[PDB]
Amino acid sequence: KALKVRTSATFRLPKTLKLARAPKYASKAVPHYNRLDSYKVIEQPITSETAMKKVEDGNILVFQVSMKANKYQIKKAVKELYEVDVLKVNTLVRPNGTKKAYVRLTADYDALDIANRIGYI
Amino acid sequence: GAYKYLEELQRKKQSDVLRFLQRVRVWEYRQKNVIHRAARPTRPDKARRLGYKAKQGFVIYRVRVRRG
Amino acid sequence: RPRQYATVSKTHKTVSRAYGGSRCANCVKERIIRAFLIEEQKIVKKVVKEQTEAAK
Amino acid sequence: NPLTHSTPKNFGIGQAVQPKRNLSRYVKWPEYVRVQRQKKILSIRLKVPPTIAQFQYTLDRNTAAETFKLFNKYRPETAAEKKERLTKEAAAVAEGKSKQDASPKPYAVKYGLNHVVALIENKKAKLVLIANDVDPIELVVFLPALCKKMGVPYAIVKGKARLGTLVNQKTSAVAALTEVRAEDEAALAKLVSTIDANFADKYDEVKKHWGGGILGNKAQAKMDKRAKNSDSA
Amino acid sequence: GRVIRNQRKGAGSIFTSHTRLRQGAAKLRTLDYAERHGYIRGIVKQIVHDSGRGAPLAKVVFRDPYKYRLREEIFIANEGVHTGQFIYAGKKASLNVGNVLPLGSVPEGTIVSNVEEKPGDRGALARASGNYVIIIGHNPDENKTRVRLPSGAKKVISSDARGVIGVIAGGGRVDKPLLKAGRAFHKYRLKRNSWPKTRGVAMNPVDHPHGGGNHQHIGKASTISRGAVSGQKAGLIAARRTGLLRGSQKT
RNA sequence: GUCUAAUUAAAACAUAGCAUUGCGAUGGUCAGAAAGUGAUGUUGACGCAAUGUGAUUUCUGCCCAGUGCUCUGAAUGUCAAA
RNA sequence: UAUAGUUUCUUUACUUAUUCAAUGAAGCGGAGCUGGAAUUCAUUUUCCACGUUCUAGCAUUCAAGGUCCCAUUCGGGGCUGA
The rounded distance, in Å, linking the Cα atoms of A65 and A41 is 6
Nearest to residue E112, comparing CAs of E88, E144, E148, E140? E148
The rounded distance, in Å, linking the Cα atoms of E214 and B38 is 72
Contacts of residues E206-209 at CB distance under 8 Å and 24 or more positions apart, as own/partner, are E206/E1, E206/E2, E207/E2, E207/E4, E208/E4, E208/E5, E208/E234, E209/E234
The rounded distance, in Å, linking the Cα atoms of E129 and E169 is 5
The rounded distance, in Å, linking the Cα atoms of A78 and A59 is 14
Sheet of E133-139: strand order equals E153-158, E144-149, E133-139, E111-113, E164-165
* E246/F56 CA-to-C1' distance in Å: 25
Peptide bond into E196 cis (omega under 30): yes
Side chain identity at residue E78, one-letter code? N
Resolution given for this structure, in angstroms? 3.1
> Residues E52-75, buried b or exposed e (16+ Cβ, 10 A)?
bbbbbbbbbebbebeeeeeeebbb
Q: What is the DSSP letter of E50?
A: P
> Residues E81-106, buried b or exposed e (16+ Cβ, 10 A)?
beeebebbbbbebeeebbbbbbbbbb
List E48's β-bridge partners, or say none.
E57
With a 7 Å cutoff on the CB, does E5 touch strand F? yes
List E154's β-bridge partners, or say none.
E148
Q: Beta B35-38 vs B60-63: how paired, if at all?
A: antiparallel
Nearest chain D CA: its distance from A2 CA (Å): 12
Q: What is the DSSP letter of D110?
A: B
C20, C22, C27, C30: CA torsion to nearest 10: -60
E55 Rama sector, left if φ>0, alpha if ψ -120 to 50, beta otherwise: beta
Side chain identity at residue D141, one-letter code? V
* E238/F31 CA-to-C1' distance in Å: 21
Alpha-carbon distances, residue E176 vs B61, E127, E183, E188 (angstroms): 68, 20, 12, 17
The rounded distance, in Å, linking the Cα atoms of C14 and E250 is 70
Number of Cβ within 10 Å of residue D79's Cβ equals: 8
Backbone torsions φ then ψ of D115, nearest 5 degrees: -45, -50
What is the distance of C-alpha D169 from the center of its chain? 15
Non-local (6+) Cβ contacts of D209 within 8 A are: D50, D53
The rounded distance, in Å, linking the Cα atoms of E59 and E84 is 11
The rounded distance, in Å, linking the Cα atoms of E220 and E132 is 40
CB E189 within 8 A of CB E17: no
**Residues, chain C:** 56
D176, D179, D183, D188: CA torsion to nearest 10: 40
Is B37 an interface residue toward D (CB < 8 Å)?
no
Q: Which nucleotides of strand F are protein-proximal, with an atom < 7 A from a CB?
A: 12-26, 28-31, 36, 38-54, 61, 64, 67-71
The rounded distance, in Å, linking the Cα atoms of D35 and B30 is 10
Q: What is the DSSP letter of C12?
A: T
Non-local (6+) Cβ contacts of B22 within 8 A are: B13
Q: Do chains C and E touch (3 or more CB pairs under 8 A)?
A: no
Alpha-carbon distances, residue C28 vs C40, E18, E42 (angstroms): 19, 41, 21
Alpha-carbon distances, residue A111 vs A99, A119, D34, D60 (angstroms): 20, 12, 79, 100
The rounded distance, in Å, linking the Cα atoms of B59 and D60 is 38
DSSP sequence for A72-119: HHHHHHHHHHH---EEEEEEEEETTTEEEEEEEE-SSS-HHHHHHHHT
Angle at D182 between CA D179 and CA D183, to 5 degrees: 120
DSSP sequence for A53-85: HIIIII-EEEEEE-TT--HHHHHHHHHHHH---
Where is D191: in which H helix or E strand? helix D185-198
* E68/G66 CA-to-C1' distance in Å: 27
Alpha-carbon distances, residue D75 vs A45, D115, D118, D176, D223 (angstroms): 89, 17, 21, 11, 51
Number of Cβ within 10 Å of residue D49's Cβ equals: 20
Tell me which protein residue sits closest to nucleotide F50, measuring alpha carbon to C1': E235
The rounded distance, in Å, linking the Cα atoms of E223 and E238 is 7
The rounded distance, in Å, linking the Cα atoms of B44 and B28 is 19
The rounded distance, in Å, linking the Cα atoms of D135 and D39 is 12
Chains in contact with E, counting 3 or more C-beta pairs less than 8 Å apart as contact: D
CB E105 within 8 A of CB D56: no
The rounded distance, in Å, linking the Cα atoms of E9 and E15 is 6
Nearest CA in chain D to A3: D24
Backbone torsions φ then ψ of E217, nearest 5 degrees: -165, 160
- Nucleotide nearest E180, CA–C1', reads F16
Q: What is the DSSP letter of E100?
A: -
CB C43 within 8 A of CB C37: no
CB E67 within 8 A of CB D17: yes
Q: How was this structure determined?
A: cryo-EM
The rounded distance, in Å, linking the Cα atoms of A103 and A61 is 5
Q: Is D129 helix (H, G, I), strand (E, B) or coil?
A: strand
- CB burial of residue E155 (10 Å; 0-12, 13-18, 19+): middle
* E8/F33 CA-to-C1' distance in Å: 18
**Residues, chain A:** 121
The rounded distance, in Å, linking the Cα atoms of C35 and C18 is 15
Nearest chain E CA: its distance from D232 CA (Å): 20
Number of Cβ within 10 Å of residue A37's Cβ equals: 13
Chains in contact with B, counting 3 or more C-beta pairs less than 8 Å apart as contact: D
List E144's β-bridge partners, or say none.
E139, E158
Non-local (6+) Cβ contacts of E228 within 8 A are: E237
Number of Cβ within 10 Å of residue E37's Cβ equals: 12
Strands (E), D105-153: 127-131
The rounded distance, in Å, linking the Cα atoms of D219 and D5 is 47
Strands (E), E13-161: 39-48, 57-61, 72-76, 85-90, 111-113, 133-139, 144-149, 153-158
CB E98 within 8 A of CB D47: no
- 3-state secondary structure string across D48-106: CCCCCCCCCCCCCHHHHHHHHHHHHHCCCCCHHHHHHHHHHHHHHHHHCCCCCCCCCCC
Alpha-carbon distances, residue D68 vs D59, D191, D228 (angstroms): 12, 11, 47
The rounded distance, in Å, linking the Cα atoms of D129 and D57 is 13
Q: Beta E85-90 vs E153-158: how paired, if at all?
A: unpaired
**Radius of gyration in angstroms for the set of CA atoms belonging to chain D, rounded to a whole number:** 27
Where is C54: in which H helix or E strand? helix C25-55
The rounded distance, in Å, linking the Cα atoms of E78 and E58 is 9
Alpha-carbon distances, residue E160 vs A107, B64, E65 (angstroms): 87, 42, 22
Contacts of residues D143-147 at CB distance under 8 Å and 24 or more positions apart, as own/partner, are D143/D116, D143/D117, D143/D174, D144/D51, D144/D54, D144/D199, D144/D203, D145/D51, D146/D117, D146/D120, D146/D121, D147/D120, D147/D200
CB E160 within 8 A of CB E143: yes
Non-local (6+) Cβ contacts of D57 within 8 A are: D156, D199, D206
Q: For chain E, how long is the longest CA-to-CA vector? A: 73
